[PDB]
């Protein structure tokens, strides 16, 4: 109930929302059908359009007009955005030579540069080049300000998840808006685009920028706009608010455009009908910039031009239908489209088995344009699992395609030629970033970065302390002229032990054999110094990682590698080694095929044993430092130590072996040596964070040897590849992965073929950021370099995506 008898006389676009049954005059009132009777009349004036003309210049103030060309308009702060161009011979901002903004040039009374976030729906990254001739204002912003070639959205690449990730710095799994459509089993409620339930605050986790602002005494314009309010009115309102008294005027503002997304859905991302939408957005940017210039705010305000996601070509003919795989199709509900989420139609149906459903969707047609996944087997980079609103069954849909339940859904609901929501590494989903203003840099290209990092930068820009979030603060300091956050390395929590030789062979009863009873003084001096760390400068190039939780571990040195061996988990947390360009691959000899040797530095009671692996019919074992790459026949013995050993399913061994035997050498050739740090990961509760001992759900049969859920490797080299990895004077180059440790290769449809036809493809799917690996391990890499910490942070957030240019 709204008693709409009240008025918006002098309350138009009020910043503070008033509580029912008083009527509302804010920029959201329409959407809740709650505006006062006169709102349209007073607040949505359209008389005479949006631009001054020669004859209007110096006119008599007619309050009915949408914007004003009178002489008093500047002081009221309600002129048309072109008033000074037409009525005072000033130039449009786009026609002006751009000039470095070394410091904020603001009016007196401004306590900080304001921030204007100009967000655009479906603004695919490639529009910056491909639409440049029709977008001169945006193109000025881009070239004079700071820009990245693209910005990576979060998965799913939909609107609501991404706009709210921009607002909070949080992954959808953490903020809760996990799709445009959702069901919450705890609430027994649903969330839709249409309707009212999306206005309840229990859906919306984390702390968005405007609340972070308000709580620290920085005033915020309201970010949301009702869809009926034209774009021109939104700009004029922002400019009106900027004219307000110093004690009332907000410091942070948001504009939103529904274009180009709206048109892109109908006409495809590059349809000829798309040129006009891009023209109008650019015209809107020009209106804003011309307004800021009239108010002498154009060299004061920092403007962010940012998109939420891109757009792909998708038509009805390219729709896979679950009815061509599943017989039981009525007993399930599907969230459809560019991603698939399946749950049961009724929880009273006990016969619903998600296992048999996954199997029925697995490699069934030879060109199948989706892959099913238990949500916890989704690549860790998507961070799309740890929320009760994300269904256990998920379908990652191929770019260009759609998934529906039945054919009736497609022809009872061809209309669209574009869509989005796919995997966030897909080029067509990439979007834009431009920063322009005194606090941003001048004519600077920055590398691609993920949208989860902006929240921190927008806080920096406003002198705010960010709420806890998934950004890595300082990873984008290179966007800013000043105002930078100056971060410290986390303090190491657990210091390592450095065990020497403390145990005799005969104390070990592992059930392990090795064919190694093989016998000088100078060569025995030589092997001790390898076991005290003479080649550690070689294999540990960036310092040892720091352990940031309480645990008990040992550094173990060897000729070819160095490990941090966990006594609690009975394996390394990490193993570091360097393969130069010149290094050579040898085979595992016949005498050492099933050789596992006791490590005399580590007690029997903190070691694995071979008997457990024998008794476990499902589980075999592998090695973190690969025997294949031992530097000498003598050094190869070190690779068979029990402390280099880890549990591996035979299906995963195929992957691991190919990676170790072929790809590691390949990368060293292509990159001029590589440093490799490999290790296990335990995420049984799929929260993206290192598991404690008591969260481990599976052990090797009849033992305390915990089974990893994943295996990682960080592959580092010199960005200048003319210098070898071990002698790099400059910036580093990194690529990493988190492979799921799975007992079958059902994920790879071509896995019965040779490993050269599917393994590298699987690793690409599971590419990762070092920062991903850090959350999952509690480790901190790159502790000792000649590089700045900010540069290291940027490097830690890098993702190698394996997409073309
Ligand atoms: C991305 O960044 C985010 C943000 O930094 C990271 O998420 C944080 O991770 C922390 C560790 O997991 C987590 O800390 C916990 O806080 C609990 C209190 O949580 C409330 O308060 C915060 C702060 O205001 C608030 O933000 C939370 O909001 C969540 O929940 C509501 C829904 O109820 C949503 O509105 C919102 O979307 C958000 O949901 C998301 O997070 C929750 C977890 O909080 C998930 O469950 C959801 O699926 C969703 O992803 C909350 O309102 C606190 O209760 C926890 O304490 C337990 O664990 C500690 C460990 O120190 C233990 O010592 C205690 O005993 C305690 O256990 C007790 O409860 C247990 C279960 O009921 C039980 O087992 C025990 O026996 C005890 O009874 C914990 O300290 C923090 O909340 C989240 N924050 C957010 C916003 O998600 C995220 O990790 C980052 N991701 C990556 C990959 O880096
Ligand atoms: C979603 C979303 N998350 N954050 N934003 C704001 C936001 C963040 C950023 C940013 F700066 F972050 F880039 C830039 C712009 C915006 C404005 C988006 C906008 O005006 N839209 C039209 C209205 C619809 S839906 C609607 N739904 C819930 C509420 S409520 N309960 O939270 O009040 C109110 C609503 F009207 C959403 C899209 N939209
Ligand atoms: Ca969108
Ligand atoms: Ca975990
Ligand atoms: Na076995
Ligand atoms: Na297979
Ligand atoms: Zn859309």
In what helix (H) or strand (E) does residue 680 lie, and over which residues does it extend? strand 674-681
| Pairwise CA distance, residues 592 & 766, whole Å | 32
Length of the chain: 805
Supply the residue whose CA is at minimum distance from atom 1 of ligand 2: 160
Ligand (nearest to CA of 705): 5
Residue in the structure block whose two tokens are 């309201």: 222
Looking at the CA of 619, which ligand is closest? 5
Atom 83 (ligand 1) nearest CA:
174
Closest residue (by CA) to atom 18 of ligand 2?
224
What H or E segment, with its residue span, contains residue 674?
A: strand 674-681
Question: Which residue puts its alpha carbon closest to atom 41 of ligand 1?
Answer: 174
Tokens 């903190």 appear where? 606
Provide the greatest CA pair distance for the chain. 105
The whole-angstrom separation of Cα 37 and Cα 228 is 16
CATH number at residue 530: 3.40.570.10
775 ligand 1 Cβ < 6 A: yes
Q: Is the sign of the CA dihedral 679, 685, 691, 696 positive or negative?
A: negative
CA 695 to centroid of ligand 4, rounded, Å: 8
Q: Cα(195) to centroid of ligand 7, in Å? A: 17
Cβ–Cβ < 8 Å for 432, 309: no
Q: Are 745 and 735 in contact (CB under 8 A)?
A: no
d(CA 406, CA 717): 50
Among 174, 375, 466, 710, name the best residue to mutate to test ligand 1's pocket (greatest count of ligand atoms within 8 A of Cβ): 174
Query: What is the atom index within ligand 2 of the atom nearest the CA of 203?
Result: 31
Which atom in ligand 2 lies closest to the alpha carbon of residue 204?
32
Q: How many CB atoms within 10 Å of residue 226?
A: 15
Closest CA to 308 of 521, 182, 411, 158: 158
**Token digits for 266?**
């109908």
Which residue has a Cα nearest atom 17 of ligand 2?
224
Q: What is the DSSP string of 59-93?
A: ----TTBSSB-STTHHHHT-B-TTHHHHHH-PPPG
CA distances from 617 to 570, 586, 614, 700, 755 (A): 20, 29, 7, 10, 23
Q: What is the DSSP letter of 591?
A: G
Question: Rounded to an integer, what distance in angstroms lies between the CA atom of residue 566 and that of residue 569?
Answer: 5
The dihedral over CA atoms of 255, 256, 260, 265, expressed in degrees to the nearest 10, equals 180
Cis before 21 (ω within 30): yes
Which DSSP state fits 96?
S
Reduced to 3 states, what is the DSSP secondary structure of residue 30?
coil
- For residue 692, what are the domain limits? 505-797
To 10 degrees, what angle do helices 789-797 and 770-777 make? 90
Packing angle, helices 136-144 and 275-294, rounded to 10:
60
- State the DSSP H helix or E strand holding residue 346, giving kind and residue range, or none if neither: none
Q: How many CB atoms lie within 10 A of CB 460?
A: 22
Closest CA to 737 of 774, 779, 775, 773: 773
Q: What are phi and psi of 278, to 5 degrees?
A: -75, -35
512-528 b/e with 16+ CB inside 10 Å = b? Answer: bebeeeeeeeeeeeebe
How far apart are alpha carbons 17 and 32 in whole angstroms? 12
Residues with catalytic roles: 159
Query: What are φ and ψ of residue 511, in 5° steps?
Result: 75, 20
Nearest-angstrom CA–CA distance, 684 and 709: 7
* 403 three-state secondary structure: strand
Contact between 721 and 672 (Cβ < 8 Å): yes
Region at 296 (left for phi over 0; alpha for psi -120 to 50; beta for the rest): left
Q: Give, to the nearest 10 degrees, the angle between helix 454-461 and helix 159-168.
A: 40
The answer for 370, left when phi > 0, alpha when psi is -120 to 50, beta otherwise, is beta
Question: Does residue 610 have a cis peptide bond before it, meaning omega lies within 30 degrees of 0?
Answer: no
The pair of three-digit structure tokens given for residue 614, joined into one six-digit string = 């024998």
Measured between alpha carbons, how far is 669 from 585 in angstroms, rounded to an integer?
12
Q: Are strands 418-419 and 146-152 parallel, antiparallel or unpaired?
A: unpaired
Nearest to 561 by CA among 497, 504, 492, 636: 636
CA distance 646 to 630: 18
Compute CA 135 distance to the chain's CA centroid, rounded to the nearest angstrom.
Answer: 28
d(CA 622, CA 514): 15
> If you measure from the C-alpha of residue 698 to the centroid of ligand 4, how many angstroms do you get, rounded to a whole number?
14
Distance 39 CA to ligand 1 centre (A): 42
d(CA 304, CA 154): 18
Q: How many CA atoms, within 13 angstroms, populate the side-chain half-sphere of residue 436?
A: 25
Tokens describing residue 517:
């009873």
Pairing of strands 393-397, 370-374: antiparallel
Q: Taking the CA atoms of 24, 29, 35 and 40 in sequence, report the sign of the dihedral they define.
A: positive
Q: What are the binding residues? A: 121, 159, 180, 261, 265, 308-309, 420, 683, 685, 687, 689, 691
Handedness of CA 10, 15, 16, 21 (dihedral sign): positive
End-to-end CA distance of the chain: 54
**CB distance 797 to 453 below 8 Å:** yes
Q: Which two tokens stand for residue 673?
A: 């040596």
| Under 8 Å between Cβ of 159 and 179 | no
Q: Which atom of ligand 2 is nearest to the CA of 177?
A: 1
Contact 115, 301 (CB under 8 A): yes
Residue spans of alpha helices (H) in 449-507: 454-461
Pocket lined around ligand 2, Cβ cut-off 6 Å:
28, 31, 117, 119, 160, 163-164, 166-167, 198-199, 201, 204, 223-225, 254, 256
CA 700 to ligand 5 centroid distance, Å: 9
């Amino acid at each position: 109930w709204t008693a709409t008898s009240g008025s918006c006389k002098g309350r138009c676009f009020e910043l503070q929302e008033v509580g029912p049954p008083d009527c509302r005059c804010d920029n959201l009132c329409k959407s809740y059908s709650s505006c006062c009777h006169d709102f349209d009349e007073l607040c949505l004036k359209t008389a005479r359009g949006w631009e001054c003309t020669k004859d209007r210049c110096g006119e008599v103030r007619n309050e009915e007009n949408a914007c004003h060309c009178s002489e008093d308009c500047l002081s009221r702060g309600d002129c048309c955005t072109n008033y000074q161009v037409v009525c005072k011979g000033e130039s449009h901002w786009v026609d002006d030579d751009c000039e470095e903004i070394k410091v904020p040039e603001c009016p007196a009374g401004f306590v900080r540069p304001p921030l204007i976030i100009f967000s655009v729906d479906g603004f695919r990254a490639s529009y910056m080049k491909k639409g440049s001739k029709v977008m001169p204002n945006i193109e000025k912003l881009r070239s004079c300000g700071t820009h990245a070639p693209y910005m990576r959205p979060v998965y799913p690449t939909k609107t609501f998840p991404n706009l709210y990730t921009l607002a909070t710095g949080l992954y959808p799994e953490s903020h809760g808006i996990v799709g445009n459509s959702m069901y919450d089993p705890v609430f027994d409620a649903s969330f839709h685009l249409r309707g009212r339930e999306k206005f309840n605050h229990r859906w919306w986790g984390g702390q968005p920028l405007w609340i972070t602002a308000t709580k620290q005494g920085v005033r915020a314009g309201t970010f949301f706009w009702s869809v009926s309010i034209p774009h021109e009115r939104r700009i004029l309102t922002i400019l009106q608010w900027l004219s307000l008294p110093d004690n009332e005027r907000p410091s942070v503002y948001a504009f939103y455009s529904e274009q180009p997304d709206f048109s892109g859905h109908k006409y495809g991302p590059f349809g000829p009908e798309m040129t006009n939408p891009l023209r109008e957005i650019d015209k809107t940017v020009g209106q804003l910039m011309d307004g800021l210039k009239q108010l002498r705010l154009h060299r004061c305000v920092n403007v962010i031009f940012v998109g939420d996601h891109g757009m792909e070509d998708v038509t009805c003919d390219r729709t896979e239908f679950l009815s061509n795989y599943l017989t039981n199709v009525d007993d399930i509900t599907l969230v459809p489209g560019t991603l698939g989420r399946i749950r049961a139609k009724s929880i009273n149906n006990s016969k619903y088995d998600p296992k048999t459903i996954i199997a029925a969707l697995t490699c069934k047609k030879p060109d199948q344009h989706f892959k099913p996944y238990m949500k916890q087997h989704l690549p860790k980079r998507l961070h799309y699992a740890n929320n009760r609103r994300i269904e256990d069954i998920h379908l990652l849909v191929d770019r260009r395609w759609h998934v529906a339940r039945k054919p009736l859904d497609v022809y009872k609901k061809c209309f669209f030629q574009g869509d989005h929501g796919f995997d966030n590494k897909v080029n067509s989903m990439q979007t834009v970033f431009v920063g322009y203003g005194p606090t941003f840099k001048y004519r600077t290209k920055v590398p691609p970065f993920e949208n989860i990092e902006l929240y921190n930068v927008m806080c920096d820009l406003l002198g705010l302390k960010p709420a806890p979030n998934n950004g890595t603060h300082g990873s984008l300091n290179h966007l800013l002229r000043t105002n930078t956050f100056r971060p410290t390395m986390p303090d190491e929590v657990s210091r390592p032990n450095y065990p020497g030789i403390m145990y005799l062979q005969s104390e070990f009863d592992l059930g392990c054999t090795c064919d190694d009873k093989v016998e000088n003084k100078l060569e025995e001096l030589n092997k001790r110094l390898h076991t005290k760390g003479s080649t550690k400068e070689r294999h540990l190039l960036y310092g040892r990682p720091a352990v940031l939780y309480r645990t008990s571990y040992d550094i173990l040195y060897h000729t070819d590698f160095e490990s941090g061996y966990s006594e609690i988990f009975l394996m390394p947390l990490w193993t570091s080694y360097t393969i130069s360009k010149q290094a050579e691959v040898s085979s595992i000899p016949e005498h050492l095929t099933n050789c596992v040797r006791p490590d005399v530095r580590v007690s029997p009671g903190f070691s694995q044993n071979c008997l457990a692996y024998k008794n476990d019919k499902q589980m075999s074992y592998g090695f973190l430092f690969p025997p294949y790459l031992s530097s000498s026949p003598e050094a190869k013995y070190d690779a068979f130590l029990v402390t280099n050993m880890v549990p591996m399913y035979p299906a995963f061994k195929r992957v691991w072996a190919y990676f170790q035997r072929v790809l590691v050498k390949k990368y060293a050739s292509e990159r001029n040596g590589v440093n490799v740090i490999s290790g296990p990961i335990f995420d049984y509760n799929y929260d993206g964070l290192r598991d404690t001992e008591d969260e481990i759900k599976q052990y090797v049969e009849g033992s305390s040897i915990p089974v990893p859920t994943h295996y990682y490797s960080i592959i580092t080299s010199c960005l200048d590849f003319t210098q070898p990895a071990d002698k790099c004077d400059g910036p580093l180059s990194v690529s990493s992965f988190i492979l799921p440790h799975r007992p079958d290769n059902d994920e790879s449809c071509n896995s019965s073929e040779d490993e050269s036809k599917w393994v590298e493809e699987l690793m690409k799917m599971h590419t990762a950021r070092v920062r991903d690996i850090e959350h999952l391990t509690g480790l901190d890499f790159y502790r000792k370099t000649s590089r700045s910490y900010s540069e290291i942070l940027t490097l830690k957030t890098y993702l190698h995506t394996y997409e073309s240019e």
